[PDB]
Amino acid sequence: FLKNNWVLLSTVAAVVLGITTGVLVREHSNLSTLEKFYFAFPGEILMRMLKLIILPLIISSMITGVAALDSNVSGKIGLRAVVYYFATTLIAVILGIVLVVSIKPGSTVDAMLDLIRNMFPENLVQAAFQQYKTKREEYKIVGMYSDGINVLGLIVFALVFGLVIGKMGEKGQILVDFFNALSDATMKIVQIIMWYMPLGILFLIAGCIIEVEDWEIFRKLGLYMATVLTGLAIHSIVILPLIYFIVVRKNPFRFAMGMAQALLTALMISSSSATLPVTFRCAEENNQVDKRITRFVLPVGATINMDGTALYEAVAAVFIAQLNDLDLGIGQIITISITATSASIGAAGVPQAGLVTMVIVLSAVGLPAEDVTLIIAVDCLLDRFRTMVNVLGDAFGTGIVEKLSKKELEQMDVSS
Ligand code: NA
Ligand code: NA
Numbered sequence: 001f002l003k004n005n006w007v008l009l010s011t012v013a014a015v016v017l018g019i020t021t022g023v024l025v026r027e028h029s030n031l032s033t034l035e036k037f038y039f040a041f042p043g044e045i046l047m048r049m050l051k052l053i054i055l056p057l058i059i060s061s062m063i064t065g066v067a068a069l070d071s072n073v074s075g076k077i078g079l080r081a082v083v084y085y086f087a088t089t090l091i092a093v094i095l096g097i098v099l100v101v102s103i104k105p106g107s108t109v110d111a112m113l114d115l116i117r118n119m120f121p122e123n124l125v126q127a128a129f130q131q132y133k134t135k136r137e138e139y140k141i142v143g144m145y146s147d148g149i150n151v152l153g154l155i156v157f158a159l160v161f162g163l164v165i166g167k168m169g170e171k172g173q174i175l176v177d178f179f180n181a182l183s184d185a186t187m188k189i190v191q192i193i194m195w196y197m198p199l200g201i202l203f204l205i206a207g208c209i210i211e212v213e214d215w216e217i218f219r220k221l222g223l224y225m226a227t228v229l230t231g232l233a234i235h236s237i238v239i240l241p242l243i244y245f246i247v248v249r250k251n252p253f254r255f256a257m258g259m260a261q262a263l264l265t266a267l268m269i270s271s272s273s274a275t276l277p278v279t280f281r282c283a284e285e286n287n288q289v290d291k292r293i294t295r296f297v298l299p300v301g302a303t304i305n306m307d308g309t310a311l312y313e314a315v316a317a318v319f320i321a322q323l324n325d326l327d328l329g330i331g332q333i334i335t336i337s338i339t340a341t342s343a344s345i346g347a348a349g350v351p352q353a354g355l356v357t358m359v360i361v362l363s364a365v366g367l368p369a370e371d372v373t374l375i376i377a378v379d380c381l382l383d384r385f386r387t388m389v390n391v392l393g394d395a396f397g398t399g400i401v402e403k404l405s406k407k408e409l410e411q412m413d414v415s416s
Helices: 006-028 033-039 041-068 074-103 108-117 151-168 170-211 222-247 252-269 273-286 291-304 307-323 330-342 356-365 369-375 379-404 406-414
Strands: 130-137 140-147
Touching: 006 170, 006 252, 033 170, 041 151, 041 170, 041 273, 041 291, 074 222, 074 291, 074 307, 074 330, 074 379, 108 130, 108 330, 108 356, 151 170, 151 291, 170 252, 170 273, 170 379, 222 252, 222 307, 222 379, 252 273, 252 379, 273 291, 273 379, 291 379, 291 406, 307 330, 307 356, 307 369, 307 379, 330 356, 356 369, 379 406
Parallel strands: none
Antiparallel strands: 130 140
16 A cells, blocks of 8 residues: 555655754754755756646646637636636635734735736747836836746636637647647656655755754744734635535535645645646546546636735735834725735746745835845745645635536536
8 A cells, every 4th residue: 555655655754854854954064055055956956847847737738628628618617717716815815914913913006017918928939938027217118028937828828729729620629639648748747757756855845944044033933923824724724615615515624635635745845736637636536526627627726826825925015014113004904905816816837936926015015125035034834835725725616616517517418
């Protein structure tokens, strides 16, 4: 039995050995900056592999999932998924705002316009490794292209392309076959990378622990951890199971038990995109969910649905505002809530710590962007829990959308 699940136990042992090695090296050894950088080399290699595999997986899976569905019922399923994601994000934002205000632990228009611009890129080839940003200048607007994959535009193009080739009929069957084969090949390559994962996980955790030097910053920011962790726990244990139970009259915790494999995997990597194959297997096999709904809903949720991220950012922005003793009125609460939801619509193909999402909210509330370094220390610990919450929300949404589309799925069975 151990051989079949050998990757999971190996990764758990890697986590244990990483904590031990990091603590022992930090306490009993002295390292310079260059030596600390060279210590985390295998973790850097693992991250490069995952970033490499993101693009083909996302594009091919999106096209295949959209083209599988019939054109009659494609719109309703997408609308239901969008509504669920929007509602969950709003509830998470409200919960985070309420908790951060109660506990008290301590332009933007251009960013929104850039967000809309990135949905319709000028060039498809450039959109695979570059993004678009605008800045003011003495007032004249000037645009520039910066490195970083544009997952928002590629997802929109993939959705439209999949619909077009699924409506065409026999004339576009060769394209469907091409992208199905590409998706299968990408999943197999992801498995091959997951074979090597444990060593990268070991060295990543070891490097994470060693970096902290003072070790009193954790004690100072103890209240800040409690707010974020309590919000994530309440959202994961209370709100999401209750929403699932209201729509689907089943046991919400049996679904989580079936998805436990992908949940713990998502904790390991802390990447929602890289957990797509495990999530597919767990949803289709353990929970007996339909493949047609799953293959289409899950990639969209990975790119779009970010409950833990919205909660995390909102709490951090309010905490930073409280650090500076800046007053926050009723309007300030709303504009932080609204900006947090729409800050980073798509950031799935980017598996590393992004401070730009915080910077948008900071600019909207009118605070300097140099306050990020104060709390940049604990991101390495909080990000894994945030990604786990995101993956859990996606998994719950798959079943919720599947239940609500019984008539559409029955209509799709007579044409098969
Ligand atoms: Na949501
Ligand atoms: Na997600």
